[PDB]
């Protein structure tokens, strides 16, 4: 996998390869930072919704454990030599984020649809549609992604079937939110809408970076993907947790859990 992505055709100067590098190893410190305050604040959360920020937790040591992983496979792979840092072994890919993708959006989204206060028969069926499109588009992403530096038309099309999956997926998670926003405690029908706006702008992001190869294919292209990596990670994992976490305990609080309303005290 490492020699059918563009990382592989550049060599990087010191710069811009500990710019990356510092990404990656900023994006670990993060989320086992918001793991602690996922776990801490799991005590103020209603049994309702207390899964909800569990997930988070999931989602957090599954991301960090990734971004951990790739900067150490960058710096393995890579050695400075003659002014620059020139590829060693073949280490490095972005495949192993499609990976950590599989394993996320699912949390994510089952933290979502818990806030809802869905339940039961529609719970699991609409869980399973979602997740089915979510691992399309994944899938089929990675499909794609496997031809960015050898047929850009095959990444395009394999890009165009995994965005059908990303619009129907949004249109099922959408429908379900301003169906069911008016069952929410709190006032958080208010901010659940805000929730689906960034969903709507943090995953937007991923096709972008997808694409980078097609529209700046050079090493400060390399770089741009990984900022709009870190961008979209940091808002789609953990500014999203967040909210999800503040519904969460606003609801519990409206519910009479007391230990929800101590902390929001
Ligand atoms: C094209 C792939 C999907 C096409 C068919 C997807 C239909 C399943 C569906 O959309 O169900 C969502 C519903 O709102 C939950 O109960
Ligand atoms: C492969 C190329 C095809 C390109 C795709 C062209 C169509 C894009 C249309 C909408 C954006 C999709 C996002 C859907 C936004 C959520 C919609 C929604 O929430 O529905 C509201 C509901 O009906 C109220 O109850
Ligand atoms: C870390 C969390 C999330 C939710 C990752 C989201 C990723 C996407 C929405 C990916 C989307 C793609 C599109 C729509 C088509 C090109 C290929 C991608 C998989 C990158
Ligand atoms: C909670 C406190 C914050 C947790 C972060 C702790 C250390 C993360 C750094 C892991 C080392 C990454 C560097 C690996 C490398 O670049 O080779
Ligand atoms: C921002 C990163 C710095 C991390 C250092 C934090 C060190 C302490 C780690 C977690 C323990 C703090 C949580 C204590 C539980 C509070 C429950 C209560 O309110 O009684
Ligand atoms: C991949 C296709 C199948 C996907 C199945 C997804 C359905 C999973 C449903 C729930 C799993 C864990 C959450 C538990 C529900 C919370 C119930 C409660 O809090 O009382
Ligand atoms: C590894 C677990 C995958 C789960 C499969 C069940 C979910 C179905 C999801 C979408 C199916 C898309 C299949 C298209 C792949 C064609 C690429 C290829 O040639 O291998
Ligand atoms: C299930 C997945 C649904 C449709 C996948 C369509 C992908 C076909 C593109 C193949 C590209 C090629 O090898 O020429
Ligand atoms: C992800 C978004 C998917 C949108 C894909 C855009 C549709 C493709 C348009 C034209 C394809 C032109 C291919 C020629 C480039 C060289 C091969």
Redo the contacts with the bound molecule.
């Keep these: 996998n490492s020699m059918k992505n563009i990382e592989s055709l550049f060599d990087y100067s010191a710069g811009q390869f500990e710019f990356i590098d510092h990404l990656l190893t900023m994006g670990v410190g993060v989320h086992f930072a918001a793991l602690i305050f996922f776990l801490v604040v799991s005590q103020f959360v209603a049994?309702?919704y207390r899964?909800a920020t569990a997930l988070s937790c999931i989602v957090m040591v599954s991301a960090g454990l990734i971004l951990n992983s790739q900067a150490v496979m960058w710096t393995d792979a890579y050695a400075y030599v003659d002014g620059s840092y020139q590829l060693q072994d073949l280490t490095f890919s972005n495949g192993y984020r499609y990976v950590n993708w599989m394993a996320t959006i699912?949390c994510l989204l089952?933290q979502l649809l818990?806030v809802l206060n869905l339940?039961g028969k529609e719970?699991?069926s609409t869980?399973?549609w979602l997740?089915?499109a979510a691992?399309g588009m994944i899938i089929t992403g990675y499909v794609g992604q496997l031809y960015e530096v050898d047929d850009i038309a095959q990444l395009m099309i394999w890009g165009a079937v995994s965005t059908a999956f990303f619009v129907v997926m949004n249109w099922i998670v959408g429908t379900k939110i301003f169906k069911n926003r008016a069952t929410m405690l709190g006032g958080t029908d208010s901010t659940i809408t805000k929730v689906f706006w960034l969903m709507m702008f943090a995953w937007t992001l991923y096709p972008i970076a997808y694409l980078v190869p097609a529209f700046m294919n050079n090493a400060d292209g390399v770089v741009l993907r990984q900022l709009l990596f870190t961008i979209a990670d940091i808002s789609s994992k953990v500014i999203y947790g967040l909210m999800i976490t503040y519904i969460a305990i606003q609801q519990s609080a409206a519910a009479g859990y007391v230990p929800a309303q101590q902390a929001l005290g």
């Design positions: 049994p309702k899964i699912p089952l818990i339940k719970l699991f869980a399973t997740i089915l691992w």
